[PDB]
Design a protein around this ligand. Structure first.
Ligand SMILES: Nc1ncnc2c1ncn2[C@@H]1O[C@H](COP(=O)(O)OP(=O)(O)O)[C@@H](O)[C@H]1O
Ligand SMILES: Nc1ncnc2c1ncn2[C@@H]1O[C@H](COP(=O)(O)OP(=O)(O)O)[C@@H](O)[C@H]1O
Ligand SMILES: [Mg+2]
Lengths: 507, 188, 25, 469, 467, 120
């Protein structure tokens, strides 16, 4: 009943002592399944270790069950045959990292796929290293600005943390990632090393044409200085989609060990869980719940808890993880959304009735929360977003009473009106991230309540005209806001004056 | 792999797998009857109560089992086929399966001789002239260049008799099944 | 029952409960 | 190369063949002889003493333990050219239209890699099919994976007939239909309607659709790989023909059913709901082979079954992950009476952006979706008390949204026998003007049944005049 | 002994021993690693084969790799030299301040106390918080559980529990973070340092930390409760002290045990969990009971999945629970920090046969008057009789004063707010709420009770407000 | 020593001790481990006996010698167990001295038939 007990290796064992295949560095391929070889030999291989197949392929080896090495094939299983010769490489699989990976779409073993030349990497980091502990890291001390006003006001991100974008399929959720990338152009144009940034978009099991659309959007927004795009599409193999987030996270770990800041966007991390379930169930590892095996939480935690700000001794480098989860019709109670919501330090939740109700971007909150999302803000946005969050918290209770709000009292009517103006301030066009200074100005206008008399369909037109007016005329005021970091009574008085005058001359 | 030499009867299971490996090895090195008589001598050895009591019992520390079988091999000077066969059965721990692999490889060699395991039921104690003419017509009946090994069994229940199974081919003139065919004919 | 049926039923009665509080106010 | 082997164990498709001289690699083709027809085997795993575990495509009634198979070096090769246009072939490569053999020169191998990242095209141009709810709420893409989901009885086959008619006649290039486990009479009506409409010409080589049809009652190796046959034919019409080609795969859920059936029998642990663990990987291969490249432009409309209107089944969810512009075909709006019961509130588009299509089209589409999404919660407000207390404006937008939702219905030309109405063609600009004219407040007085089964807004005017006087 | 790694699946590696063999539930040092790789033996299958849950990243393990066997189930460093120290389930310090120089080790995987090593007296454990010790009081040997979150003051209440029990009783405490987030664990460590519970300067700290992080395999997370319980069992059994095991999460303990039993090939139970759920919770939750000598007491932060109570992990948890104090944001946005809901906190010890007739009479009066205030608050919000009666206005004034009085200034919040933190014993809470319910202090404003410790300082605050 | 009446633990795992030999054993029998523990021999197989233990598996190694008691699973019984906390097997765990039981009642006999019963 044994797996290695077949008459081929038994016959070559008892017809005469071989000592010829060496059984330790090499190994002959036994039963090759749909994507998993169970090779015989490799007595000196270690666990999770990348071997190569004589076709010219690679493949990483797990389960070792006392006579057999469970090597999962890094490619198509058409050209691996029974009896082929495997060879050890000698090391757990590495990822070529460096500052030469930037602006070039690569593939999860660290090899170039866009065909515009090879990667000029100088050092290879071992993938799947342990996360840094308690003392080497510190908390979120820098504000990570998405550019989305709803996110940067209500649920801001911190340079130093992990923030799980969660929603149904085609409910924003990658547009927020592309806005998070394109927002960092203005911080990567100039000075301040502790502001400049490196985005890493790890696409796991997407279509490959949408990765081409993603990289064309980033190139014509000139988003290829900050960015690396790691891509393991749906045509690629199951273990190469499994190993894609750890590769990009190793690149980001290179960026945060050397002082600099970085973020990573794990697009379709649920598909990484699906690929791991595929390869484990074909390794006949015992399935846990929904056929996901035991160490799936251990997988996503070992992936996601590598993101933290570092103390001033260990550079000042920080990482920001942004995993992405498709839920199936709001089923937040599934296996993978419950696992990653228990892992991650915040969630950005997108319920979709807001999207088709016409408030885009689709961050439909109340379930959405950031567990550190007050200290990860500039004091301008801290003040304005604190008052704005309390106003929306008073608004969202009474909206079912606002569908019949016409025949109620006046205090509600004022509160619900202010909430409607703020909720239509939070909507924003796609692929146009706002800087912190102008969104502080807009949400300031909404909080101080120079909008309560206007029509609802005229709020967004006011928003665009107010952006044009404040960018064109009052450059120095946005300079005050972005250099002081806050409104200190003179920006307050000047904004009183300019918003009263522009409301006097709007129509 | 190496080209595994095809055995004539595919005996399946674990013991058939060990036996096909041993047959392919002994047919590459062409000492088949030598390995067969040595496995018969081993099967005579491992029915001794001291050796089989030492082997079937656990907590005799498998390394000591391998050492004891290697010393028993080096005492009676086996060929290098069955030496490595007994060592492999000791290393895998399927020394419980060694009389069954001896039976399976004996079956494979008995088909390599060309024997056919003939079964006959006369359903009565038959005489020697009947057996002589039956072996004559059956040896003519089977094939060219093959030798039969026949057995006879009896039971008074099945009336008449003379069922003959030769090489999966089962000719049946038993009076009971004639009454059964007429029974299916009569009920309709 | 099935799962989606009870999800539909809970959605319907949560909406009827909110609208009935609205009629109460 | 043609190495012979022995069938030793037979369960359906799943047939174990023992090779000892030459072992074929995985995903191959074995010709089982001894049958009066040919039997083909897709080679997969090699378990030992060399053992291929193959899946057998024709019915295995009558396979002897110990039969002789022949081994060729083909993943599986099919006749492919301009000769295979007006003719129906099945997955092995053989014609089932009873018109002799297919005389071609070059063949093609069914299994290939999805091409490369550097060959992926980047252009996105809108495709207008003449259907209202498609043209404004989920427009198509010349060079994009169009998918239309639905349960059973929602209208996917009538919609795919309307797309085949209204697009494959409005196409100078070629077409490829792939009936992947579609029932035989609907494909038969497709073949006879194609002959009588003239897109198949039985007299000469003036045809422009190539049909690959695997019936719904074939073993799962013949019902999974027939989609790949359609992919191979339409790849040749895209790779080195140099032609804009469109492929209609109806109905890729038999692919996943076939994979789940063999994975039950191959010896793989069942995944989530009961499908194979290799669902996302296998469908990733066969949905990333089908995309437009820099060499040629190929557009793929896919009729994709969902089981009993369950969109959270993992195979429709991963199919959503592969598309570019889906279209949900619900049932509830046909319990209303709108056909096909299209959900645009669950439909997507990569093509719908204010720079791609326009600002006018985008704003009227988002206005229609905004007023239909608001109509749901407002309708649940209605459902307890009624039309009495909503407001002036609330009752006005309820009636306006209901009028729009009745205006989404459109009589198909191929479905002039289900409703009796003749069926019309609507251009894009007329759909934009009609929905912008209903949102603009022009038609607040006409009844809801005046907009029900119409084409342009002039047809709604004519039906309102017919109902009134 | 010396055995050999022969197969590796993560936290499941099995060792083939050829000689003297460790029993079930034991420790193994895998050698050749740059760190220690401790393993836990259980399952002897043959050739002395033991299925060891392997406790760290098992990349680099080779077939036939030598394993030293240490005997003991797991030895950790316990002692009074462990306070202020962060360790992980090997017993290894991960706060990078040298080793834990202690004298006596102790084995996790110990047993429950015997039936003769029990206390038959349900002594009311008095924290010192008014709302806790009046409406859901604690128990020596209790297994109590707090239902908090992020925005609520869970950390402030935890450090206030540590300081109040270390001052009032003589007990130190241990905080087992099970599946503790490394960001959240680092913030809680800096919070304890800047509050003064942990002192890095001398030997006056009050808590020992055991952080089993999420990035560790579930074999190394289902032992965090066992490790922190072993440290607290040292405090119970060699000082006879009043100890607090604070487990930050019982659901991650159950999830870690579920993933261990999933990795070990066992057919899983109901809703996705392990068969051994009630048994594992039995082992741990019955080691935290009181004895005749000490009074270990668990306060444990508990996560209910899908907001469900009938799920098996809360089913076994509430089978072992005693108090279930709710923390929330509603009464926190009413200004009271933190919003320990009493109306949703059903303590089992609230019984006049156990805590006394005066205590239970006062507690029933408080809970009844706040329930009646919630009903009359609904009616006064809808304005049906608009101040319904003099009795309505009287109970609204009384219970508004009580809700303002349930606040207490905390000593852990003293360092940045000048509201000095008071300890309020049980007798003073009884006297204060009895004199408020008796109508004695009706002539005081409601603001004179917000953030005051005892009742006579609320009198003095009413005097100092009258200016 | 003797595989008739004693046996050796092949593999104690999750809750089962598969013990080798033990040929004189009978089904559902309290068989005691030399770790001082008890168990009950459940399913008899031609290679091993599946004895489920009556305690933790931590106290039992592999190859620990297992010995038959000779009687089906019992519990001590009587009026001499009155006033007393016992374990599930009959051992007094209240600490105030051992039990003075003389009889020994089997733990798994059948309920009475419908004739020796009479109604409430
Ligand atoms: N203004 C907008 N704000 C946010 N999201 C938008 C906006 N316009 C379109 N989107 C949607 O965001 C989606 C991003 O893709 P994504 O949701 O990740 O695809 P998938 O359906 O595979 O999850 C696009 O499909 C697009 O429909
Ligand atoms: N435009 C239309 N007008 C009238 N009926 C339609 C239209 N489109 C679809 N149908 C209805 O759809 C049904 C056909 O369903 P079909 O498409 O075969 O099922 P599926 O959607 O599962 O393929 C017919 O009953 C037909 O009445
Ligand atoms: Mg997407």
């Amino acid at each position: 009943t044994g797996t290695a007990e077949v008459s081929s290796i038994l016959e070559e064992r008892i017809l005469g002592a071989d000592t010829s295949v060496d059984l330790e560095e090499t190994g002959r391929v036994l039963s090759i399944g749909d994507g998993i070889a169970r090779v015989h030999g490799l007595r000196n291989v270690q666990a999770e270790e990348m071997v190569e197949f004589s076709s010219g392929l690679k493949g990483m080896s797990l389960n070792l069950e006392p006579d057999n090495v469970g090597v999962v094939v890094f490619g198509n299983d058409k050209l691996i045959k029974e009896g082929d010769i495997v060879k050890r490489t000698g090391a757990i699989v590495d990822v070529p990292v460096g500052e030469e990976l930037l602006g070039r779409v690569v593939d999860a073993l660290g090899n170039a796929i866009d065909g515009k030349g090879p990667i000029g990497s100088k050092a290879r980091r071992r993938v799947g290293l342990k996360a840094p502990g308690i003392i080497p890291r510190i908390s979120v001390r820098e504000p990570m600005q998405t550019g989305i006003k709803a996110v940067d006001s209500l649920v801001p991100i911190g340079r130093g943390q992990r923030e799980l974008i969660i929603g149904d399929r085609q409910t924003g959720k990658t547009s927020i990632a592309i806005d998070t990338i394109i927002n960092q152009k203005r911080f990567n144009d100039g000075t301040d090393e502790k502001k400049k940034l490196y985005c890493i978009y790890v696409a796991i099991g997407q279509k490959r044409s949408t990765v081409a659309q993603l990289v064309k959007r980033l190139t014509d927004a000139d988003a290829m200085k900050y960015t690396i795009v790691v891509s393991a599409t749906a045509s690629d193999a199951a273990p190469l989609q499994y190993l894609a987030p750890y590769s990009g996270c190793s690149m980001g770990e290179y960026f945060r060990d050397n002082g600099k800041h970085a973020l990573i966007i794990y697009d379709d991390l649920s598909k990484q869980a699906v690929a791991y379930r595929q390869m484990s169930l074909l390794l006949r590892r015992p399935p846990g719940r929904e056929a996901y095996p035991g160490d799936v939480f251990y997988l996503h935690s070992r992936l996601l808890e590598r993101a933290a700000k570092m103390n001033d001794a260990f550079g000042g480098g920080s990482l920001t993880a942004l995993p992405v989860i498709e839920t199936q019709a709001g089923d937040v109670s599934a296996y993978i959304p419950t696992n990653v919501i228990s892992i991650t330090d915040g969630q950005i939740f997108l319920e979709t009735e807001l999207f088709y109700k016409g408030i885009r971007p689709a961050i439909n909150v109340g379930l959405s929360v950031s567990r550190v999302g007050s200290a990860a803000q500039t004091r301008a946005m801290k003040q304005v977003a604190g008052t704005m969050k309390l106003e929306l918290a008073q608004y969202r209770e009474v909206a079912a009473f606002a569908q019949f709000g016409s025949d109620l009292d006046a205090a509600t009517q004022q509160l619900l009106s202010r909430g409607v103006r703020l909720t239509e301030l939070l909507k924003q066009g796609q692929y146009s991230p706002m800087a912190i200074e102008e969104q502080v100005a807009v949400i300031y206008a909404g909080v101080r309540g120079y909008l309560d008399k206007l029509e609802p369909s005229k709020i967004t037109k006011f928003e665009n005209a107010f952006l044009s007016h404040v960018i064109s005329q009052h450059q120095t005021l946005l300079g005050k806001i972005r250099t002081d970091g806050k409104i200190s009574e003179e920006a307050d008085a000047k904004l009183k004056e300019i918003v009263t005058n522009f409301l006097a001359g709007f129509e | 792999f190496a080209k595994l030499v095809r055995p004539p009867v595919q005996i399946y299971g674990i013991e058939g797998r060990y036996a096909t490996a041993l047959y392919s090895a002994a047919s590459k090195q062409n000492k088949l009857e030598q390995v067969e008589k040595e496995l018969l001598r081993v099967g005579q050895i491992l029915k001794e109560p001291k050796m089989a009591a030492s082997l079937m019992n656990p907590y005799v520390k498998r390394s000591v089992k391998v050492k004891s079988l290697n010393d028993m091999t080096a005492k009676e000077k086996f060929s290098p086929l069955t030496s490595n066969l007994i060592n492999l059965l000791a290393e895998n721990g399927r020394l419980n399966n060694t009389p069954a692999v001896i039976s399976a490889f004996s079956t494979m060699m008995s088909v390599h001789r060309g024997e056919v395991p003939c079964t006959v039921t006369t359903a009565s104690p038959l005489d020697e002239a009947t057996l002589t003419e039956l072996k004559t017509v059956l040896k003519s009946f089977l094939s060219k260049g093959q030798v039969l090994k026949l057995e006879v069994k009896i039971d008074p229940s099945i009336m008449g008799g003379m069922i003959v199974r030769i090489g999966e081919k089962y000719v049946d003139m038993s009076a009971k099944t004639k009454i059964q065919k007429l029974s299916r004919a009569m009920r309709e | 029952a099935t799962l989606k049926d009870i999800t539909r039923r809970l959605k319907s009665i949560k909406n009827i409960q909110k609208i009935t509080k609205s009629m109460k106010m | 190369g043609g190495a012979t082997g022995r069938i030793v164990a037979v369960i359906g498709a799943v047939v174990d063949v023992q090779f000892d001289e030459g072992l074929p690699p995985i995903l191959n083709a074995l010709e089982v002889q001894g049958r009066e027809t040919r039997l083909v085997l897709e080679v997969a795993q090699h378990l030992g003493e060399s053992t291929v575990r193959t899946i057998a495509m024709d019915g295995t009634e009558g396979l002897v333990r110990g039969q002789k198979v022949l081994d060729s070096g083909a993943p599986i090769r099919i006749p492919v050219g301009p000769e295979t246009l007006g003719r129906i072939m099945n997955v092995i490569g053989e014609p089932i239209d009873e018109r002799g053999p297919i005389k071609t020169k070059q063949f093609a191998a069914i299994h290939a890699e999805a091409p490369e990242f550097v060959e992926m095209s980047v252009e996105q141009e809108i495709l207008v099919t003449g259907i209202k709810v498609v043209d404004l709420l989920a427009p198509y893409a010349k060079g994009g994976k169009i998918g239309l989901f639905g349960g059973a009885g929602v209208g996917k086959t009538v919609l795919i007939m309307e797309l085949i008619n209204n697009v494959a006649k409005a196409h100078g290039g070629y077409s490829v239909f792939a009936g992947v486990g579609e029932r035989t009479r609907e494909g038969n009506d497709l073949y006879h309607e194609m002959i009588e409409s003239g897109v198949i010409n039985l007299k000469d080589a003036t045809s422009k659709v190539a049909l690959v049809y695997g019936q719904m009652n074939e073993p799962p190796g013949a019902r999974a790989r027939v989609a790949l046959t359609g992919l191979t034919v339409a790849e040749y019409f895209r790779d080195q023909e140099g032609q804009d080609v469109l492929l209609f795969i109806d109905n890729i859920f038999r692919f996943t059913q076939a994979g789940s059936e063999v994975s039950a029998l191959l010896g793989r642990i069942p995944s989530a709901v009961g499908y194979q663990p290799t669902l996302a990987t296998d469908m990733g291969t066969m949905q990333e082979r089908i995309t437009t490249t820099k060499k040629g432009s190929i557009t793929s409309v896919q009729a994709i079954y969902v089981p009993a209107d369950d969109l959270t089944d993992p195979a429709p969810a991963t199919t959503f992950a592969h598309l570019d512009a889906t279209t949900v075909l619900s049932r509830a709006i046909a319990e209303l009476g709108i056909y096909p019961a299209v959900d645009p509130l669950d439909s997507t588009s990569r093509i719908m952006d204010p720079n791609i299509v326009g600002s006018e089209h985008y704003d009227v589409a988002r206005g229609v979706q905004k007023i239909l999404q608001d109509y749901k919660s407002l309708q649940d407000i209605i459902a307890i008390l009624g039309m009495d207390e909503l407001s002036e404006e609330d009752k006005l937008t309820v009636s306006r949204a209901r009028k729009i939702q009745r205006f989404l219905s459109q009589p198909f030309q191929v479905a002039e026998v289900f409703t009796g109405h003749l069926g019309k063609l609507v251009p894009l600009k007329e759909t934009i003007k009609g929905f912008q004219q209903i949102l603009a407040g022009e038609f607040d007085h006409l009844p809801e049944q005046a907009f029900y089964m119409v084409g342009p807004i002039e047809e709604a005017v004519a039906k309102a005049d017919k109902l009134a006087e």
